[PDB]
Amino acid sequence: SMDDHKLSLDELHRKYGTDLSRGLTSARAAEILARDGPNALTPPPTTPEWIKFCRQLFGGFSMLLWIGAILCFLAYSIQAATEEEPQNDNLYLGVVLSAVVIITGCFSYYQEAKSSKIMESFKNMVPQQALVIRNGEKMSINAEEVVVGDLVEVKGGDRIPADLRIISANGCKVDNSSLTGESEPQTRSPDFTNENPLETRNIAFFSTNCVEGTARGIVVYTGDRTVMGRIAGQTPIAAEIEHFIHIITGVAVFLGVSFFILSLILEYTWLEAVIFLIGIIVANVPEGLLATVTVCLTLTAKRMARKNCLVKNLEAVETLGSTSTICSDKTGTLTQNRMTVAHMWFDNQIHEADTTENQSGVSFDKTSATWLALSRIAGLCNRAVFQANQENLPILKRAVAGDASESALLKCIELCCGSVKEMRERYAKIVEIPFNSTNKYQLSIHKNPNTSEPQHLLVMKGAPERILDRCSSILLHGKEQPLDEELKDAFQNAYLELGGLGERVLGFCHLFLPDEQFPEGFQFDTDDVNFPIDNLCFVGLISMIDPPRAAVPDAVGKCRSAGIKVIMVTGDHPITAKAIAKGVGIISEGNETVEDIAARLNIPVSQVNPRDAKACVVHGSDLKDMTSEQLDDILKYHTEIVFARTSPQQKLIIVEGCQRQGAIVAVTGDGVNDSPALKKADIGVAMGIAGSDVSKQAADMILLDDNFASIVTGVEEGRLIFDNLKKSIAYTLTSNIPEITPFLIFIIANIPLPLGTVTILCIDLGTDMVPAISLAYEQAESDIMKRQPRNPKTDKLVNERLISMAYGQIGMIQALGGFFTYFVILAENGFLPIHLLGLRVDWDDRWINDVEDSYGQQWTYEQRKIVEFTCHTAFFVSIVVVQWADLVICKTRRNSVFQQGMKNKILIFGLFEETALAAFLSYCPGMGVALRMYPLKPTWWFCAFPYSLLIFVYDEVRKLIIRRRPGGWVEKETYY
Amino acid sequence: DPFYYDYETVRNGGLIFAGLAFIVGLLILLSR
Amino acid sequence: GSWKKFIWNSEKKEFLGRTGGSWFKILLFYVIFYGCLAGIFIGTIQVMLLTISEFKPTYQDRVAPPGLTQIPQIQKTEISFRPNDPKSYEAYVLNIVRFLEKYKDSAQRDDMIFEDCGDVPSEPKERGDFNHERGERKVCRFKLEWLGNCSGLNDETYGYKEGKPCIIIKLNRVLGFKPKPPKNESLETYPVMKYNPNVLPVQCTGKRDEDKDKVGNVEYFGLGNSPGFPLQYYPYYGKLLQPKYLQPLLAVQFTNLTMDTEIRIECKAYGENIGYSEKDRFQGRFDVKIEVKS
Ligand SMILES: CCCCCCCCCCCCCCCCCC(=O)OC[C@H](COP(=O)([O-])OCC[N+](C)(C)C)OC(=O)CCCCCCCCCCCCCCCCC
Ligand SMILES: CC(C)CCC[C@H](C)[C@H]1CC[C@H]2[C@H]3CC=C4C[C@@H](OC(=O)CCC(=O)O)CC[C@@]4(C)[C@@H]3CC[C@@]12C
Ligand SMILES: CC(C)CCC[C@H](C)[C@H]1CC[C@H]2[C@H]3CC=C4C[C@@H](OC(=O)CCC(=O)O)CC[C@@]4(C)[C@@H]3CC[C@@]12C
Ligand SMILES: CC(C)CCC[C@H](C)[C@H]1CC[C@H]2[C@H]3CC=C4C[C@@H](OC(=O)CCC(=O)O)CC[C@@]4(C)[C@@H]3CC[C@@]12C
Ligand SMILES: CC(C)CCC[C@H](C)[C@H]1CC[C@H]2[C@H]3CC=C4C[C@@H](OC(=O)CCC(=O)O)CC[C@@]4(C)[C@@H]3CC[C@@]12C
Ligand SMILES: CC(C)CCC[C@H](C)[C@H]1CC[C@H]2[C@H]3CC=C4C[C@@H](OC(=O)CCC(=O)O)CC[C@@]4(C)[C@@H]3CC[C@@]12C
Ligand SMILES: CC(C)CCC[C@H](C)[C@H]1CC[C@H]2[C@H]3CC=C4C[C@@H](OC(=O)CCC(=O)O)CC[C@@]4(C)[C@@H]3CC[C@@]12C
Ligand SMILES: *[C@@H]1O[C@H](CO)[C@@H](O[C@@H]2O[C@H](CO)[C@@H](O)[C@H](O)[C@H]2NC(C)=O)[C@H](O)[C@H]1NC(C)=O
Ligand SMILES: *[C@@H]1O[C@H](CO)[C@@H](O)[C@H](O)[C@H]1NC(C)=O
Ligand SMILES: [Mg+2]
Ligand code: NA
Ligand code: NA
Ligand code: NA
Ligand code: NA
């Protein structure tokens, strides 16, 4: 429909609730909140909470265990009609195969719903903020409640929160890429230019940003009724677990089909063969890994939010842990960006600031016209103003509306030389200049209040090396002593002795223009430059100290021990950047640049071999003319690189240069010029308290505390998930040999069967469901930040060393621990072990009711099948007993369990749930006819204690050899 | 009698152990 | 894995991605590893065999009331034959002849092993104790002539040639077991037969109600005149102490079977020790289906 862009501001009075200034109103706010819908775009409804349940109950690899129950109930339904004495045995088989599906589907749905509930809790974690100008006095609000008739003020880098009509802008430029497809900013103005209401300048749009400038606009639509409100993934660590599950599925399907047609030769009663096939396929395929990976990801994301490191998608979790390069900025991230004045220099003497109450009187609060003029220059250039409720607050804290340097400068002026706003109205600012990035020239021409001098003053401040050509004549005692060469040498010495401790310096110069250029009447403008700028009245230098953050100098050491390379990209002088890098530990001691060894041996810099210097400080002006080959070996031959005097716009040329060597680069940005460099890096980090919305729509992280050390803690939490996934995969695969081998030795050796299909499903449901997911909650070992970064090209999760440990070494001990208990039971009832070789044909014969044992007595058919089902029960129980030691050794990878501790509460619950399920399935009245499971003697629970102890002893001695001998044969062959 | 072996005592002990090992796991899990 | 490039290099000599001095170590590791695993398994088995006696099993409660079986070893508890067809009943006669080899009178002549227990039923004979202090124990000898009209001293087809077939019933051996016949309250067991205090009684009747009208007459042959197992034997001492032990037998003949009908017959044994089951249809009891085609 037609939007109110054609009608001007008078009809904007006469279209909304009478407000174009001073805010709208409280009452009106509630009324237009109740009239229209709030600013939330309404979500599409997803599938309800029973379709997600039937996709897990009747899903993949559970239809097999449903059709097994259907066939069992069909065989019982056939038998109950055309047979007398119907003998309901397939009824309980169908009941058991139906109960296994319900339990496994309920566990899978619970583990899916918990991770969905956690990952849904990151929206409204860092909501949106809109700047309105309500009756109050300019406030930020939750942005999902604004109304039609508000006036909002946006600036460079903010998000437009509603449908806007612009009233007063200073060249804001919206990027029209969400509804047109243009990658070019467009100028906005309150006029009426285009006939089409969409490609015009009258209005602004939802889900857009007006980069530069500011704007004051009025809301026309909110919520669903905007032009955006109408109209309308995998993980590289999940797409590998899928590919592994497909290969294990093919192997298990081959094994189950091969075991299916091998049983029918042994007269195995077609229902039993089908149930045996289904039980092999279901139990030998690790379907519960695909849940575990999600629980490994989402939980980790939650912990990253508890340490001020917020992710934007789950694909950014597994790539943050493989980070090999961090290219961070200096101001705001490494340092606090709360600077105070220290160590001014004027009249060939470094002074002290004397910030505190201990007034050393350092030639201050007195009469000496050089520092009076210097403090007057540093007082009438500070654009920052103070807020209300501050003039009765001490020096120790002050709210102030401005950037860092001028807020630092206002401290010394409001401390030393009275109030400040009286000094602003004394010398009237007649033309201002905003702070430019090209020459860094802050100027504000002033005039006398009534009279102070016949030559009224013009001011100049900025970088001292960028004003050394402009202002040269010093102010010793009011005297403009001209350019002097040893004085420039002393200025250079002051520059090195003020940048050498790590301070940003600012120069100060001024002018006494006569009345020849402006009289007392009409003044002169500064946009048309008719002022002499060369050989001006320099007064002195002011520097400011900037403390680095709290937990940074050991976070850089943890980045160094973990093989991550840190790059510092600042916009400061290349001697202060070297000082800050040596202060925080970027350039550690022992490492030096070519300037240091050149000034060491007193050979000039230009002929030093650039191979003995591993640290390097690159000026930003040389970055523009160097081609790709010089950058691609600056980043190759050095180890500690610091880019100084560098614009953020050329950050991108760094990042690709680090990506060609092969690296996962993490880049911090907070501006609108960094957004080409954020989404070219492998992981982009936005800032949380500073940083506009364009900077955080392009990044994969949010730093909620603006600290560098939170990135390092995020690298820890990202590194943890590969360890936890390898531990869970290693635990899950060990229970495959004791489920395969009892049927193999049944065929080969012709002994009675040690394990049936019901106890195979019991083994799988008991020892694979709960304790395999408890290794996702495992704490971090002591050597996660002492290993190198993993390469996601040559380092997969599964190796030939992970398969040959689970299938070849640990699984065989569990198979032997089961077979021992089988032989112990069958030898204590009368069948000695040599007598069992060859007994299978007579044992399984229903019409041979006198089978002789080693003592000579004669067994019935049911009397020996009861002993066989007791052997099945204790096979399952001994598998649970060795599962214990399999779960205990599979929670560490190179540390011992005595230096890891039992801090995992889910693992102890897994052990107790295992043992409670085993002791309940054996000793409950009623399991003898349903499950065919019979009670064990109390001394049969200790038959697989030595094999469970052997697993523990073997794995502890193996890990000890790996720790005390790195790079040996045991680490090369067994360390998975 | 070498032919009897009452199973009720070991069944009572096993069910007591199952109830104990279930409630202690419940108290370890819900300890948070 | 790719193809040739991975099957062999000969610029590093790496068959399957592993050099030949590395294939030797990874196989020596698995040979030593499985050798020590086999050693530990054999050692635990040999240690467990030291707690096992060689005269008495550790647990006897899973054979505790014995089964009751019949000697023509048949395939679905079914006997079916034609008397004027000497190829239908030949397997049954061959089974009975192969079973009654060791019961012959010429196979019991060794008087230092076999002994002459009485020809009337008597009390159990304790041979001592399970302690090997007397060596091998002697065994009572069973004469075939007590199975008369069912032994091989006559009709050598055991009745199958002339209509009326005959089975041989025996109770399963349990080491150390002494059967207790029921008491004599004259109300206790069912229904009525001749009672003897040293005979475990057996009775074979028809199963359904139409089978009781068709089974006809049933003859028993054993030691004495009360049908059942004598008690002079028992309790089996085991095949270490008593090789060539001979369990007592009981022959049952069906002299007046009804022709061309399938008849179900249940044989039960009575006593205090003897108990029955509902799933085990061979414990203390059995059943047979006979069908004499004409
Ligand atoms: C009741 C509890 C008892 C528990 C007992 C459990 C025993 C624990 C055994 C587990 C250890 C597993 C590795 C053992 C092999 C150690 C090899 C070694 O030391 O490397 C030397 C060294 C390590 O030092 P290196 O290799 O790095 O030397 C470096 C050389 N320079 C410096 C020049 C580079 O490796 C070798 O060079 C040669 C090793 C060849 C290995 C050949 C295979 C040996 C066969 C081992 C059989 C052990 C099986 C026993 C398991 C039985 C348990 C069921
Ligand atoms: C009697 C037969 C037919 C089954 C009857 C239904 C099942 C008892 C249902 C009820 C709730 C289901 C499950 C839903 C919750 C899980 C949480 C699980 O605990 C954990 O996962 C560890 C703690 C944690 O994950 O934080 C243990 C019980 C279990 C498997 C439940 C087991 C029983 C399920 C399959
Ligand atoms: C490890 C898994 C995959 C297989 C382990 C079981 C074995 C495959 C089978 C083969 C024959 C079995 C047993 C049959 C014979 C006995 C006799 C036993 O004692 C003796 O050897 C004494 C012999 C004598 O004195 O006459 C030692 C070996 C043992 C336990 C064998 C051990 C190996 C068994 C269980
Ligand atoms: C079936 C059994 C025989 C094998 C599986 C059980 C383990 C072999 C045993 C060996 C000793 C037991 C535990 C006894 C108590 C210690 C305390 C623990 O030490 C600490 O608590 C240190 C805490 C910290 O440093 O943070 C080291 C492991 C642990 C749990 C042991 C882990 C392994 C246990 C369960
Ligand atoms: C049947 C019984 C008599 C066999 C004896 C069992 C052994 C005493 C087991 C118990 C646990 C095993 C080991 C597993 C735990 C480690 C912790 C380890 O202590 C450390 O922290 C090592 C630190 C380092 O080396 O840097 C030294 C002892 C050791 C090898 C243990 C030594 C004793 C082992 C071989
Ligand atoms: C990994 C380390 C810390 C061992 C942890 C394993 C289990 C959590 C704990 C629970 C109590 C322990 C056992 C203490 C003794 C009982 C005897 C048994 O019950 C009987 O004695 C037979 C029945 C009866 O006595 O009547 C049930 C299992 C068992 C082995 C327990 C199960 C497993 C243990 C080692
Ligand atoms: C990981 C594997 C190697 C462990 C399997 C257990 C044992 C380590 C292996 C070694 C060889 C296997 C068996 C191969 C076949 C022989 C037959 C047997 O010889 C006989 O006397 C049987 C013939 C007869 O006398 O009636 C002696 C032991 C036995 C079971 C071996 C017992 C031990 C086995 C199971
Ligand atoms: C055992 O078999 C013999 C013959 O083999 C039976 O003896 C005959 O029985 C019939 C039955 O009426 C008599 O008429 C004959 O006179 C008997 N002959 C002889 C020589 O005795 C004998 O009855 C059978 N024993 C039984 C059935 O208990
Ligand atoms: C078999 O013969 C006996 C003769 O004593 C007779 O009583 C019985 O009814 C007969 N049975 C049949 C089935 O003919
Ligand atoms: Mg930044
Ligand atoms: Na599974
Ligand atoms: Na991005
Ligand atoms: Na397992
Ligand atoms: Na498994």
Author numbering:
A (entry chain A): 40 to 271, 280 to 1023
B (entry chain C): 17 to 48
C (entry chain B): 10 to 303
Which of the paper's sentences describe this entry?
To trap hNKA in the E1 state, only Na+ and Mg2+ were added to the buffer during purification. We successfully solved the cryo-EM structures of hNKA in the E1·3Na and E1·3Na·ATP states preceding ATP hydrolyzed at 3.2 Å and 2.9 Å resolution in the absence or presence of a slowly hydrolyzed ATP analogue (ATPγS), respectively, which represent two E1 states of NKA preceding ATP hydrolysis previously unknown according to our knowledge. The E1·3Na and E1·3Na·ATP structures present two snapshots of the open conformation of the cytosolic headpiece without direct interaction between the A and N domains, which are significantly different from the E1~P·[3Na]·ADP state. In the E1·3Na and E1·3Na·ATP structures, NKA has three Na+ binding sites, namely, I, II and III, which are surrounded by M4, M5, M6 and M8. Comparison between the E1·3Na and E1·3Na·ATP states shows that the binding of ATP causes a subtle shift of Na+ at site I, which are coordinated with Ala330, Ser782, Asn783, Thr779 and Asp815 in the E1·3Na state and that are coordinated with Ala330, Ser782, Asn783, Glu786, Asp811 and a water molecule in the E1·3Na·ATP state. The Thr781, Thr814 and Gln930 residues are involved in Na+ coordination at site III in the E1·3Na state, whereas the Asp933 residue is close to and coordinated with Na+ in the E1·3Na·ATP state. The densities of Na+ and the side chain of the gating residue Glu334 were not well resolved at site II in either E1·3Na or E1·3Na·ATP, while the density of other residues around the entrance of the cytoplasmic cavity was well resolved.
NKA consists of a large multi-transmembrane catalytic α subunit, a single transmembrane β subunit, and an auxiliary γ subunit called FXYD.
